Amino acid sequence: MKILVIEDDALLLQGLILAMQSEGYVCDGVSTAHEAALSLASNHYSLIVLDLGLPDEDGLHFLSRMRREKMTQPVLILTARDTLEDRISGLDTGADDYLVKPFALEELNARIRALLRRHNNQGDNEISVGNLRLNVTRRLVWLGETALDLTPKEYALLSRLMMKAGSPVHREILYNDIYSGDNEPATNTLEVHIHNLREKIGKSRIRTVRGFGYMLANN
Amino acid sequence: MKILVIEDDALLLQGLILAMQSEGYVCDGVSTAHEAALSLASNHYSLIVLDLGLPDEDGLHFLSRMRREKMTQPVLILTARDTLEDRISGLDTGADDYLVKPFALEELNARIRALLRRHNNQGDNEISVGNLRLNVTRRLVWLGETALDLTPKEYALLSRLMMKAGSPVHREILYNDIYSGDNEPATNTLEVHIHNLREKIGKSRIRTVRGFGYMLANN
DNA sequence: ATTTCTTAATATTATCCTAAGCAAG
DNA sequence: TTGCTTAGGATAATATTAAGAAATC
Ligand code: BEF
Ligand code: BEF
Ligand SMILES: [Mg+2]
Ligand SMILES: [Mg+2]
């Protein structure tokens, strides 16, 4: 992953860079606020380590400037400004950690590791067949570029279907999926729900298997 | 929003709680790991402060297990174990931050603010949906060019709504953001608050999603 | 001293079931 | 024959009010 490091003392800068190389990340150092602005413009960084005492611009003004611009990457301020009063200012500015100089390098590597652990990991679970996009995580359904309201049961069927997509699910499975198991209606409930589901999602991407169960079209 | 605090020293434990409450979060404190274990199952916590020295089992064992079970909540270790070897170990288990005792409360509050800002928001200090502007750190909300006086609970909702905006937020979560487990109302308080909230921000920026919860509209 | 929160009785709607008269496999 | 289709009426689910307890100021 690409780490930008921002340090005005170039002696340290080469140190931080070497550490980042060594820990296994891809790294860029820059010695000033302006140069960093540039690197960020062109490159895609997974993180930013930033000193506050930069010659051209104050690090926080730089930080505040970035988030205004909707630059969202994790930032670890690594600075020599050690006041409780400062740390708060750094963290409220939108930094994701604050590490004071002097510092144990191995602390830094690990703090660095912790921010990255979450970054790569935002994976929210979707399984989709054709132009229907479904969020098992966010609960929202898309035909093309518009969205769909599915009722608790309507959603619950089309859910079970896209998990099993391509294969017929026995109808009694869906009756037990739409019910707590002790609640089974005399009339055809499942049949109505599939009709509705079909009617919105473009009937039919669910193609019916007579005498057994139901299934939906993917390939 | 709800914070779980885990502390064996009850003097501090009662202390942290008031601190957390005062910041606008609703809070649960517990004195042991096992109590913590059971609480996590029942309630939805937005962050966990976790002490290490604990009577039943060491926090790290609890943390490792949470992580093993794919518990995604941000955890801030606040411990008295300060050697650098310890600090690295916690983060590597891992915590999203590690803070040694004694500590400035105001550092803790700001670090916590930072983790939640990163978890729920893009890392952004403010959130905008439509003409709604919210400042997460100031606890302040702007509808259009005008300000909104929202009660503590009205705010805690509209906040959770805007973070998740576009995605229906499940009812059990909104409710869990507003109550400490000791205050859990028998009646339908959430339904009213949303009504009250609605009357302020207007009908209808909140679209109710039946059988699930409430959700907020952007596009 | 006044806001904010709850309680609980009543109106109200999405979603659901029901049944009847129909279309396919 | 089995499964699809429709709507008017049943049912949970959520809204509304209001005022009575709690919390803040
Ligand atoms: F110049 Be940095 F804050 F050490
Ligand atoms: F027991 Be904890 F580490 F303060
Ligand atoms: Mg410097
Ligand atoms: Mg302890």
Author numbering:
A (entry chain B), B (entry chain A): 1 to 219
Show me the paper's own sentences about this structure.
We reveal the crystal structures of BeF3−-activated PmrA in complex with 25-bp DNA at 3.2 Å resolution and with 26-bp DNA at 3.8 Å resolution. The space group of the PmrA–25-bp DNA crystal is C222, with two copies of the protein–DNA complex (complex-1 and complex-2) in the asymmetric unit. When superimposing all Cα coordinates of the PmrA dimer between the three complex structures, complex-2 exhibited the largest root mean square deviation (r.m.s.d.), 2.2 Å. In complex-2, PmrA-2 DBD interacts with the PmrA-1 REC in the symmetric unit, possibly causing the conformational deviation for complex-2. In complex-1, the two RECs form a twofold symmetrical dimer, whereas the two DBDs bind to DNA in a head-to-tail orientation. The interface between PmrA-1 and PmrA-2 is 1,336 Å2, with the two RECs contributing to 1,024 Å2. In PmrA-2, the REC and DBD are linked by an extended linker without any interdomain interaction. Interestingly, in PmrA-1, the linker forms a turn-like conformation stabilized by an H-bond and a salt bridge interaction, and REC and DBD exhibit extensive contacts via an interface of 702 Å2, with 11 H-bond interactions identified between residues from the N terminus, α1–β2 loop, α2–β3 loop, α5 of REC and side chains from α6, α7, and transactivation loop of DBD.
The PmrA/PmrB TCS is a major regulator of genes for lipopolysaccharide modification in the outer membrane of bacteria. Each OmpR/PhoB member contains an N-terminal receiver domain (REC) and a C-terminal DNA-binding domain (DBD), connected by a linker. Here, we determine the crystal structure of BeF3−-activated PmrA in complex with the promoter DNA, which also reveals a REC–DBD interface in the upstream protomer, but the interactions of the interface are notably different from those observed in the KdpE–DNA complex structure.
